[PDB]
Design a protein around this motif. Structure first.
Motif, PDB file in Angstrom:
ATOM      1  N   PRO A  40       0.818  -1.239   0.000  1.00 39.95           N
ATOM      2  CA  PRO A  40       0.000   0.000   0.000  1.00 39.95           C
ATOM      3  C   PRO A  40       0.846   1.282   0.000  1.00 39.95           C
ATOM      4  CG  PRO A  40       0.129  -0.901   2.211  1.00 39.95           C
ATOM      5  CD  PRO A  40       0.756  -1.926   1.303  1.00 39.95           C
ATOM      6  N   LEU A  41       0.329   2.410  -0.492  1.00 39.13           N
ATOM      7  CA  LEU A  41       1.023   3.686  -0.368  1.00 39.13           C
ATOM      8  C   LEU A  41       1.029   4.126   1.086  1.00 39.13           C
ATOM      9  CD1 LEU A  41      -0.719   5.546  -3.305  1.00 39.13           C
ATOM     10  CD2 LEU A  41       1.395   4.324  -3.388  1.00 39.13           C
ATOM     11  N   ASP A  42       2.210   4.460   1.598  1.00 41.23           N
ATOM     12  CA  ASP A  42       2.387   4.890   2.987  1.00 41.23           C
ATOM     13  C   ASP A  42       2.515   6.417   3.021  1.00 41.23           C
ATOM     14  OD1 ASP A  42       2.986   5.032   5.705  1.00 41.23           O
ATOM     15  OD2 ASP A  42       5.114   4.544   5.374  1.00 41.23           O
ATOM     16  N   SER A  43       1.388   7.104   2.857  1.00 41.35           N
ATOM     17  CA  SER A  43       1.366   8.562   2.858  1.00 41.35           C
ATOM     18  C   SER A  43       0.432   9.076   3.943  1.00 41.35           C
ATOM     19  CB  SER A  43       0.934   9.103   1.505  1.00 41.35           C
ATOM     20  OG  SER A  43       0.647  10.492   1.551  1.00 41.35           O
ATOM     21  N   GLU A  44       0.820  10.182   4.577  1.00 40.98           N
ATOM     22  CA  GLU A  44      -0.069  10.822   5.537  1.00 40.98           C
ATOM     23  C   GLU A  44      -1.188  11.589   4.851  1.00 40.98           C
ATOM     24  OE1 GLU A  44       2.322  13.597   7.795  1.00 40.98           O
ATOM     25  OE2 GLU A  44       2.026  15.227   6.337  1.00 40.98           O
ATOM     26  N   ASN A  45      -1.052  11.880   3.562  1.00 45.10           N
ATOM     27  CA  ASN A  45      -2.100  12.558   2.821  1.00 45.10           C
ATOM     28  C   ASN A  45      -3.067  11.529   2.258  1.00 45.10           C
ATOM     29  OD1 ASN A  45       0.527  14.671   1.946  1.00 45.10           O
ATOM     30  ND2 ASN A  45      -1.300  15.465   2.981  1.00 45.10           N
ATOM     31  N   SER A  46      -4.197  12.019   1.773  1.00 43.71           N
ATOM     32  CA  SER A  46      -5.200  11.115   1.169  1.00 43.71           C
ATOM     33  C   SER A  46      -4.844  10.932  -0.301  1.00 43.71           C
ATOM     34  CB  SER A  46      -6.600  11.636   1.356  1.00 43.71           C
ATOM     35  OG  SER A  46      -7.324  10.813   2.257  1.00 43.71           O
ATOM     36  N   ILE A  47      -4.527   9.705  -0.681  1.00 38.06           N
ATOM     37  CA  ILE A  47      -4.186   9.389  -2.065  1.00 38.06           C
ATOM     38  C   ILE A  47      -5.114   8.296  -2.561  1.00 38.06           C
ATOM     39  CG2 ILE A  47      -2.465   8.590  -3.705  1.00 38.06           C
ATOM     40  CD1 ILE A  47      -0.326   9.726  -1.939  1.00 38.06           C
ATOM     41  N   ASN A  48      -5.778   8.561  -3.673  1.00 38.77           N
ATOM     42  CA  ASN A  48      -6.623   7.541  -4.279  1.00 38.77           C
ATOM     43  C   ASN A  48      -5.731   6.490  -4.934  1.00 38.77           C
ATOM     44  OD1 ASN A  48      -8.607   6.062  -5.536  1.00 38.77           O
ATOM     45  ND2 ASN A  48      -9.870   7.863  -5.961  1.00 38.77           N
ATOM     46  N   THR A  49      -5.519   5.356  -4.244  1.00 40.91           N
ATOM     47  CA  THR A  49      -4.724   4.258  -4.809  1.00 40.91           C
ATOM     48  C   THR A  49      -5.219   3.873  -6.202  1.00 40.91           C
ATOM     49  OG1 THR A  49      -4.325   3.361  -2.574  1.00 40.91           O
ATOM     50  CG2 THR A  49      -3.898   1.891  -4.441  1.00 40.91           C
TER      51      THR A  49
END
Ligand code: NAP
Ligand code: NAP
Ligand code: A1L25
Ligand code: A1L25
Lengths: 286, 287
Positions: free
Chosen positions: A100-109
């Motif tokens: 998974p993307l490990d971002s603190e922001n909201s990212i539409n995978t």
């Protein structure tokens, strides 16, 4: 006691064949090499490990594999710039976003994955390649790497797939759902289970072929296993030691074939990614 | 015996709600109207029948439906020109290609279907829309119209789908495969069967929900059905005598809790779901 499916050994043979193809392909075409890019968002420990194992395999074979690691504070638009560039760079034959993307922001995978050009989608995670595999157009798409590798482990048993009941536990985008499609178009009768399945134990007992991809350590108990089943364990769990999603000790007594954890599906996943990368490099030469 | 899932009555309710929906849109946005196009290759009688039913339903609802029929001898390049023109006409909100193509020349069905803009793919047959459905990304795609209509028939029972074992017999691109996906993302445990399934009677007997789409008249015998099952028969088979489904309705009705008759079951739900998808793309186009 089941015969163990030695994925570490089986992958080694695959990578040797890939190296020979890459060696041969570098002569027939001088100055040319398969190029892979792996994009990571954030700094998860397991993502680091798996990415490095992939870089390691690419090195052995002669594939040129780059690793772009973006910080946790990355925005969705920052990620899209990289996907856009990689799509357009004609020297890059395949690329993937480690999930998974490990971002603190909201990212539409789903938005990120689906911007990948389908002809470079060596991980087979775009809707385009998934829709072809889901509808039985297998010779036209990249198939996800863990399913590809599980299928190869099943053939290693010699037992034909056609007409056997396959049970797949888990329906994730990367493993369980494409695994169902792969078995189906290999003409098994397939049941998919998941976290809302009732009587999971009785469902698992129906499987001549059992593929477990749940992420719950040793939850699938050996009693549940149909006697003589081919058992494929996709789990890799760090516990009080590394264990799979199948309680290996008990299941070995019932299975006719079983994958150990580690050294089963894991290396096969990596080998099949290398194979898809070489396949896209060859397709690019047309 | 089972309650009959009456598709005629349920489809009529959906068309009426669609009609009122179109009327209010047209009141809110004067002049505007949902526009469907149906492309056909060849002159198959059954396709002629089914397309005509779709035209009648669209006319009742207030959808402007155009039908373009090409001869048996068209080329793929001719078909591709029409698909491109429909993709590019901003007044067309959805279109479909009636299947199978009926051609003297070999035409790549997959190439033809996949040239449709996904936002007009009201039949949900593009690989893009299939991949969205197959992976549970259900809020961005058109779902194929027969599985959409089976899902409504099942929900008419008022029995939740989550947790039940559903058996889909058949795996075609238009019915069986998307039906499996729809039931899975409604949280059934799903078994998919096909012509290579051994012991089909025992797989069918697992189904709290049974959806049969095989084109093999009455091949699914009623004795196989689990008692209390919800039975959905997508079959439309013309047999010598009459229309029959893919399920032996006589013995099946004694065991099911609910069952779709043939005809008047799935068929009218298929047409109604296509109209619902057309109205949906028209609304999206207004956004
Ligand atoms: C790769 O997996 P991931 O990273 O997506 O992890 P995850 O979110 O836990 O999903 C792994 C898969 O295993 C399933 N699963 C989890 N617990 C289960 C249980 N107790 N019994 C049966 N299936 C279960 C999940 O079902 P759901 O899809 O129902 O969450 C999912 O499809
Ligand atoms: C309409 O809509 C319905 C579906 O038609 P379609 O578009 O799906 O046509 P189709 O393309 O002929 O699909 C038929 C499906 O039924 C399966 N099937 C055929 N004989 C079977 C058997 N004896 N046991 C189990 N599965 C069997 C086929 O399996 P394979 O995929 O193995 O051929 C296939 O998946 C029909 O009932 C028709 O009247
Ligand atoms: C779970 C796993 C294990 C291994 C592995 O090599 N396991 C060895 C021990 C290795 C060692 O420590 O040397 C073993 O189990 O024996 C490699 C890969 C993965 N999984 C993924 O990479 N999944 C994935 C993803 N998350 N995102 C995208 N886009 N694509 C993907 O495929
Ligand atoms: C089998 C069928 C029957 C009827 C029908 O009219 N049934 C009623 C009568 C009353 C009424 O429909 O109002 C009944 O059986 O009781 C409508 C539609 C279909 N099937 C399709 O059209 N399939 C299809 C396809 N071949 N190709 C594409 N692209 N899309 C598709 O959806």
């Amino acid at each position: 006691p089941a015969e163990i499916l030695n994925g570490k050994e089986i992958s080694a043979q695959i990578r040797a064949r890939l190296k020979n193809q890459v060696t041969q392909l570098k002569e027939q075409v001088p100055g040319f090499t398969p190029r892979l890019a792996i994009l990571q968002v954030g700094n998860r420990d397991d993502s680091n490990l798996y990415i490095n194992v992939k870089l390691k395999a690419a090195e052995e074979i002669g594939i040129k594999a780059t690793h772009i690691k973006l910080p946790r504070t990355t925005t969705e638009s920052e990620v899209m710039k990289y996907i856009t560039s990689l799509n357009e760079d004609s020297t890059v034959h395949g690329f993937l976003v480690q999930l998974p993307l490990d971002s603190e922001n909201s990212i539409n995978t789903e938005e990120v994955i689906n911007a990948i050009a389908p002809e470079k989608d060596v991980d087979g995670l775009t809707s385009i390649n998934a829709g072809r595999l889901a509808r039985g157009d297998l010779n036209d798409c990249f198939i996800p790497c863990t399913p590809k590798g599980c299928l190869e482990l099943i053939k290693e048993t010699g037992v034909p797939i056609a007409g056997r009941h396959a049970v797949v536990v888990g329906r994730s985008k990367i493993v369980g759902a494409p695994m169902h499609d792969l078995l189906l178009w290999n003409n098994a009768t397939v049941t998919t289970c998941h976290s809302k399945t009732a009587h999971l134990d009785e469902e698992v007992n129906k499987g001549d072929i059992l593929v477990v991809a749940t992420g719950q350590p040793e939850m699938v108990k050996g009693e549940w296993i149909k006697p003589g089943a081919i058992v494929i364990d996709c789990g890799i769990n760090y516990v009080p030691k590394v264990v799979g999603d199948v309680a290996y000790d008990e299941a070995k007594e019932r299975a006719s074939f079983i994958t150990p954890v580690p050294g089963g599906v894991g290396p096969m996943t990596v080998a099949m990614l290398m194979q898809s990368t070489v396949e896209s490099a060859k397709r690019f030469l047309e």
